[PDB]
Amino acid sequence: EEKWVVMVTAQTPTNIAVIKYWGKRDEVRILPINDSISVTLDPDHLCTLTTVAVSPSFDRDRMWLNGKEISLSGSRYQNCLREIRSRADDVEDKEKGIKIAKKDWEKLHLHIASHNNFPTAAGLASSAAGFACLVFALAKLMNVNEDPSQLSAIARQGSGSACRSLFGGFVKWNMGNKEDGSDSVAVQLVDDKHWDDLVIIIAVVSSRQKETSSTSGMRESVETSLLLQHRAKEVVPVRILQMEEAIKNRDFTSFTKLTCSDSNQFHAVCMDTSPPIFYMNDTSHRIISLVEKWNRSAGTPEIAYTFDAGPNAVMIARNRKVAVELLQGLLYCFPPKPDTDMKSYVLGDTSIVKEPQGIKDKIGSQDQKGEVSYFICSRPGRGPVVLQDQTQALLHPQTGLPK
């Protein structure tokens, strides 16, 4: 048998919902009970990088995540692979003498290696950027003839939030109304330049509490929370329309009202679940109080917050001057562990990190030390991209096994 190896490497950003996805109506096709809207983040310290490879000499589909092999046996990987394979087409690399016929893909096995630049015990959705990257890279590999919105639908079957990482900027996942899920897809609302002033600051919060997974948790809520249905039918459709308008016109005050309140309502549904799900901790509450105080002592709002399925705070600053104030604010309230290199305790961006009483005004009181593990600054970012520089591939170009 032949031993050529075709591979593709892609880099895919993560995203952060400002109007939240919580609860499915279909556990197999992954269709949600409401729309959601998110912001794609800049790749640095947040993206997932993935290399996919096909060879007639691979005996098995196999996958590696951050160095360790893992199972593709599960339904989420099995459904993406199946859907993308079924759309594979003729490929031909003439320089290398390789012709793959459409039918060949029914038997060619795949090797996938993937790397998450978010620290793994830090707590950010690895799944979102990850299934989006897999789908996007495989779609290049197999010459699938489909736009990002249709590819959205495949990524969605690996993880619901993954479908929103196929575009940059601000992205809407439409819940769709067809049974087959074909219209449950993401679409870009605006690109990453429309609102380039926003700066994002993630507080990765210390906690050893292991968090109920988003998939199980939201299933539990659909099954036991008597408030979720009312959220889904009567609250979120309206919030979707207001958030669209707020993004269109960069109304940061409307954007702040919506983001904070939809995050809080999502955590309210989690508390109304039986047994209750507690994703925020006392540090989380302390960050919200800081943000709400800071905004009251500045009249018009300067900072929004949102929280996913954990205590990590995501803060969104109206612009860079706010970001610089806030970052000194946050360092006062969340001083580090003793002997801590500030190069390690505040990742991202560079210019803002390199940069005071009038701030003590807006925050008030200092906290105990080390409630925060570290901060990450970022920005709205573009969508996924292919990497042509093979130095960045994670599979060996000849063995098809992890470097």
Q: Give the residues lining the site for ligand DP6 (CB under 6 A).
A: 17, 20-22, 30, 36, 125, 127, 159-161, 214-215, 308-309
Q: Consult the annotation and say whether 152 binds a ligand.
A: no
Whichever of 138 and 309 has its CB closer to ligand DP6, that residue is 309
Considering only 32-40, 274-282, 314-322, 325-333, which stretch makes contact with a second copy by CB under 8 A? 274-282
Out of 109, 140, 257, 382, name the contact with a second copy by CB under 8 A: 257
> Is 362 a residue that touches a second copy (CB under 8 A)?
no
Any binding-site annotation on 164? Answer: yes
Q: Is 342 in the site for a second copy (CB under 8 A)?
A: no
In the complex, what is the shortest distance from the CB of residue 39 to ligand DP6, in angstroms, rounded to a whole number? 11
* Contact partner, 160, from ligand DP6, a second copy, none, Cβ < 5-8 Å per class: ligand DP6
What is the smallest separation between the CB atom of 366 and ligand DP6, expressed in angstroms? 31
144 counts as binding a second copy under rule CB under 8 A: no
Residue from 276, 342, 366, 403 that binds a second copy (CB under 8 A)? 276
Query: Does 348 show up as a binding residue in the annotation?
Result: no
Rounded to a whole number of angstroms, the minimum distance from the CB of residue 235 to ligand DP6 is 14
Closest approach, Cβ 162 to ligand DP6, in A, equals 7
For residue 363, the minimal CB distance to ligand DP6 (Å) is 27
Residue with tokens 């539990």: 220
Q: Select the residue interacting with a second copy from 95, 147, 234, 389 (CB under 8 A).
A: 234
The token duo for 1 is 């048998």
Pattern 85-124, a second copy, x by CB under 8 A? ----------------------------------------
The minimum distance between CB 274 and ligand DP6, in angstroms, equals 18
Q: What is the 3-state secondary structure (H, E, C) of the chain?
A: CCCCCEEEEEEECCEEEEECCCCEEECCCCEECCCEEEEEECCCCCCEEEEEEECCCCCCCEEEECCEEECCCCHHHHHHHHHHHCCCCCEEECCCCEEECHHHHHCCCEEEEEEECCCCCCCCCHHHHHHHHHHHHHHHHCCCCCCHHHHHHHHHCCCHHHHHHHCCCEEEECCCCCCCCCCCCEEEEECCCCCCCCEEEEEEECCCCCCCCHHHHHHHHHHHCCCHHHHHHHHHHHHHHHHHHHHHCCCHHHHHHHHHHHHHHHHHHHHCCCCCCCCCCHHHHHHHHHHHHHHHCCCCCCEEEEECCCCCEEEEECCHHHHHHHHHHHHHHCCCCCCCCHHHHEECCCCCCCCCCCCHHHHCCCCCCCCEEEEEEECECCCCEECCCHHHCCECCCCCCEC
How far is it, in rounded angstroms, from Cα 235 to Cα 33? 12
Nearer to a second copy, 21 or 305 (CB): 305
Residues annotated within the binding site for (R)-5-diphosphomevalonate are 21-24, 76, 159-164, 215
Residues annotated within the binding site are 21-24, 76, 159-164, 215
Q: Given the rule CB under 8 A, which residues bind a second copy?
A: 226-227, 230-231, 234-235, 257, 260-261, 264-265, 267-269, 271-276, 278, 281-282, 285, 288, 292
